[PDB]
Design a protein around this nucleic acid. Structure first.
Lengths: 73, 58, 91, 104
RNA sequence: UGGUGGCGAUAGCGAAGAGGUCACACCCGUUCCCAUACCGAACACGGAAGUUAAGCUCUUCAGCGCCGAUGGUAGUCGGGGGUUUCCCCCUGUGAGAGUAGGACGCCGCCAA
RNA sequence: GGGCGGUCGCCUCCUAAAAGGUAACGGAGGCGCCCAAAGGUUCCCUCAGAAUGGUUGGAAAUCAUUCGCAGAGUGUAAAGGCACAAGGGAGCUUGACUGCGAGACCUACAAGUCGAGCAGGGACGAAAGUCGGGCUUAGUGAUCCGGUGGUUCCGCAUGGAAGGGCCAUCGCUCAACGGAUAAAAGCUACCCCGGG
RNA sequence: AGUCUUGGAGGUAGAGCACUGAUUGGACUAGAAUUCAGUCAAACUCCGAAUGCCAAUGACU
């Protein structure tokens, strides 16, 4: 039981209020823990990214569901 | 106003960033003295290194 | 294994490639008068360092007056610029 | 019940399309008495056009939704199916106003 | 009063009153448009006799759920000290649980 | 200490000190795939189990009733995710696509990952729009070498052909998975020799 | 680079419990499903903490 698989790179890519160019890696995670926000699409591995250049913000939805958004500069 | 700052210990043996904060104050020899106007940023440094530096208010 | 023994080789090579001498259109801007500009005078004064198969003229730059040109080939953009100053393109 | 079902259907259709970026949405309300219609946005809520009567003899009055939309006539508006299947009077209320100068 | 909304159920569920000229619902059928692992139940459809009994609406209840302190704690981020399969001080931000309490909703847009 | 055994790639958790990275001959488990459908799209749909009425009928396969906030399910193992459903039911289809790609993620490199948007042509729906394979992450290999095709380039004095280039495509358990050659066992100490 | 200013994560044990579990105390009683709740969880999860690193926009050095 000493065998161990490589840990895929998963985590945060950007912070709050950061000039992000469009199509840049944001938040990539398995499944769907963080829902998409304004100007945010999805990929094959459910990765969050940006479409238009601008700042990034953080928020939530209901009682236990966060989401990301990107406002135009 | 103004604030006088003097070393009382040395940075040798102390951990990493506490060397860097007392370098940015302007101190690099023990028992040196520098004058700085008061601030919230400068006062925040002194709470990081308080056992090292004793503060002298005029 | 080193990197160059993982990159595959790239087609083949031609046994006879014809590479003519090329001169910026800007090489005729420093000459006396466009007349009988034969490659055996290009090679004597030395604007071309060596005549090989043929002398090709490139259309990079601006021409000045008319000058008789004798070249193996011609670029299409190079063809009009001598034909605009008042030069002849005899191939 | 029927109402709840229709609402859910609309939501499902609202969850995909919004459109409201000066190409607004146009909703249909179908009651047992008569058919109501509203143009409305998402964040705005302003009703630039609202038509109602108050089979498709009511859709002759349902043709008025573009005849009211004639006053403005400014960008295309996406049609909302609601919880109603594009079959009957709801489907005959889209083309009717489409010919009067609305691009949808 | 209806439509579509905006806010993290403080919206909720539960319990009782109010109701309807209009609103809206049931209620009347399948003539076709369209319907069912089966069916005018639904989706449709075309019609206004009607009870409102429900849905919906207005008004009450701390029943359930939810939201939530203040203070003290605990473990530590500096620094210190002893008896160290560990323990104790001083400047540091400070929970959870628990209670006081919040609360049976607010805030837009038209339409009639 | 040499010997006996195992293991040498990829995936999820556990150690791994609350995220990138992180050890041990530390602890748990999986895989060398499957499926034209378990796919794309259009539109509907809510569930497991409890508790009654019996024709088979068992403490249990079904059967209509009161109920259920997920006790269900999703090709596969886990965790992360999900009932505005990705999960059920049908209509309809082959986008399981051609040329690409602003950028970013990862980090010695080689690779690997996601991708808005554009064009050519479609599918699907009234439309907006969605579609460059499966809820997400595993199911694979170098150059080298030969094989089957599409063809233009070249083709040694001139034409051809021969042969190679350039695209589509096959053969690797190379499994000691960044792959010493196509090919390869013990053996002996009085042992030769550099080392504890 | 250093400090403070503001909004941006993580479930480590301070932990106790709906879900999973180790259990038994007691079960329901056909001692298997499961009832009131005591326990412990490296592979248990409705809650928020102390530094950093992502930035940010300012300040001062």
């Amino acid at each position: 039981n000493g065998r161990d698989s490589e840990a895929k790179r998963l985590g945060a890519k950007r912070a709050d209020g950061q000039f992000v160019t469009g199509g840049s890696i944001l938040y990539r995670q398995r499944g769907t823990k963080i829902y998409p926000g304004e100007n945010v699409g999805r990929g094959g591995d459910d990765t969050l990214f940006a479409k238009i250049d601008g700042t990034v913000k953080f928020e939530r939805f209901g009682r236990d569901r966060k989401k990301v958004s990107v406002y135009p500069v | 106003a103004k604030l006088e700052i003097t070393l009382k210990r040395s940075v040798i043996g102390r951990p990493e960033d506490q060397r860097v904060t007392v370098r940015t104050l302007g101190l690099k020899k023990t028992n040196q003295t520098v004058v700085h106007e008061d601030n919230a940023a400068i006062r925040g440094m002194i709470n990081k290194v308080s056992h090292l530096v004793s503060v002298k208010e005029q | 294994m080193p990197l160059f023994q993982r990159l595959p080789k790239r087609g083949f090579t031609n046994i006879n490639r014809k590479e003519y001498a090329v001169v910026n259109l800007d090489k005729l801007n420093g000459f006396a008068e466009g007349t009988e500009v034969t490659p055996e005078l290009l090679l004597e004064t030395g604007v071309i360092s060596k005549l090989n198969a043929g002398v090709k003229i490139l259309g990079n730059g601006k021409l000045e007056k008319k000058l008789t040109v004798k070249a193996n080939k011609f670029s299409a953009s190079a063809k009009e610029a001598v034909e605009a100053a008042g030069g002849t393109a005899e191939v | 019940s029927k109402n709840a079902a229709r609402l859910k259907r609309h939501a499902r259709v609202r969850a995909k399309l919004s459109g409201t970026a000066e190409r607004p949405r146009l909703n249909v309300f179908r009651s047992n008495k008569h058919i109501y219609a509203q143009i409305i946005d998402d964040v705005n809520g302003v009703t630039l056009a609202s038509a109602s009567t108050l089979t498709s003899a009511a859709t002759k009055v349902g043709e008025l939704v573009a005849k009211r939309a004639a006053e403005k006539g400014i960008s295309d508006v996406v049609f909302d199916r609601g919880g109603y299947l594009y079959h009957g009077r709801v489907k005959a209320l889209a083309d009717a106003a489409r010919e009067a100068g609305l691009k949808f």
